[PDB]
Amino acid sequence: MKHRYSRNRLYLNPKEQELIKDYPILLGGAGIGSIIAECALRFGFENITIVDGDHVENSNLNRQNYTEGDVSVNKVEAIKARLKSINSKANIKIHNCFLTSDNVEEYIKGHKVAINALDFSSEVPLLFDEICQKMDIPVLHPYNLGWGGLVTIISPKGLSLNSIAKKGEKFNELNVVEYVSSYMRFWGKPQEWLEDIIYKFKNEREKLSPPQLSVGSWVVAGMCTHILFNIATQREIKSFPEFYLSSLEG
Amino acid sequence: KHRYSRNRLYLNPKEQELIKDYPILLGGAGIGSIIAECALRFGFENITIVDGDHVENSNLNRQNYTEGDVSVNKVEAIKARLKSINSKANIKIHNCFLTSDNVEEYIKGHKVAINALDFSSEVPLLFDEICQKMDIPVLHPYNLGWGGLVTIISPKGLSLNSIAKKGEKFNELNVVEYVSSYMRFWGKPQEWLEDIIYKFKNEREKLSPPQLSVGSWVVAGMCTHILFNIATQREIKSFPEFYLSSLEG
Ligand SMILES: CCCCCCCC(=O)N[C@@H]1CCCCNC1=O
Ligand SMILES: CCCCCCCC(=O)N[C@@H]1CCCCNC1=O
């Protein structure tokens, strides 16, 4: 440990603190992932690769780890500045590029765990997971459900998100969230708030991106940091088709 | 504005308008510095922050500060951070410790308050008492490592005094022991929470309780939601009820 991680004691012993220091994490996408990166860095994960090709837009400022001065800059450049001002000795490696079928494997290679925060409009969201399973790299899928944070982990030998994808039609986050609500309702725990926002979003006249709130981003960042700690320290986790849902209502 | 574009459906324009000016008083810029950013990005642009401490190294594992902030007043550092997120936001700071003499005037003028005050200061319980008198509900956020804990003292309800015993001093360990005992009594024991309580008590040296970034980030989300519910007059649980949020729900 260090005096920076002084208040981590009892929860983490010194050997765990050292372990997560160099534990190579791959983060694909610096949007929702920028909140996760700060929470995970402050926890003690100092070896983070961030890959994103987008620039900071105004609409990011309601839930992503950027400032007014960052607007029009590569998200990856801004989040590295933010992260390295929190920990100057941290090993924060960025790549201002979009992932494609040709480059995605070499980026994945060398990491012990990955966070798939990739827009489903790019080409590689599902292929990203397939390579990680092939390489024994578990994949965290964090989602911003407004009031809730949702994480599901694709484990190397388990079901992938394909299981809920339909053969022949495209797959996005609305499918994931509709699976979660149906699963919760199946078990007698309907999330009526979640079903309500899905209904409003689908019956929107105009075709827009899903709404997201700072609440869910902040909650999911904490969830991911806990999950990462469990994965690095070989504590048990729930794998997809099971998931973690956290909200004030719960 | 386009800054709140992705807030749609969850909030209508009139709610976004309402919380913009909803005056929040935040006592304590430690765990409160995480809460402040999440609430500002949500759309709460009228925040008063009162704290007398400086930024220390040990804050960096869970609080909203940088290596450059160390040795600076928390309120100046957190205001710089907040104003870099929103230049037009109304962030009023006071680098002062709260005392019996000043605490009422700070509370005056706010619709809701967040009590994140160290229990070694003079006014943690008096702060709530004054807020109760003035119809100001008070959020008490706690960092339970893996969990976020919030309880709201409502003006006409029980205060934290009810779990204090008149003969010994009262701190956050009493709140957490209350929460864990409540959970076990009602059939959902939090063995993780009891475990960290047990480890901390049997520590040789007397140190401050450990805290993690996860609970800070989770408690910041919970507080922002609770603020939105209070401001838009949606139902919330008041103390002796509470909200506990963790990876397992
Ligand atoms: C109808 C309302 C619920 C919509 C749920 C979207 C939440 C979310 O997280 N979506 C994406 C998915 C791509 C990678 C991660 N980041 C994102 O922003
Ligand atoms: C034994 C382990 C559990 C200890 C719980 C401490 C959590 C916490 O919140 N403590 C303080 C209390 C003062 C106001 C808010 N901020 C704080 O840091």
TrEMBL record, chain B:
Q: Name one GO molecular function term.
A: nucleotidyltransferase activity
Give the top-rank taxon of the lineage listed in the UniProt record for this protein: Bacteria
Q: Where does the chain bind AMP?
A: 6, 51, 53, 62-63, 74, 98, 118, 121
Q: Look up keyword Transferase and say if it applies.
A: yes
Stored Pfam families: ThiF
Report the transmembrane regions from the record: none
The protein, known as: ThiF family adenylyltransferase
Supply one GO BP term: cyclic threonylcarbamoyladenosine biosynthetic process
Q: Which UniProt keywords apply?
A: Nucleotide-binding, Nucleotidyltransferase, Transferase
The THIF-type NAD/FAD binding fold domain sits at 4-234
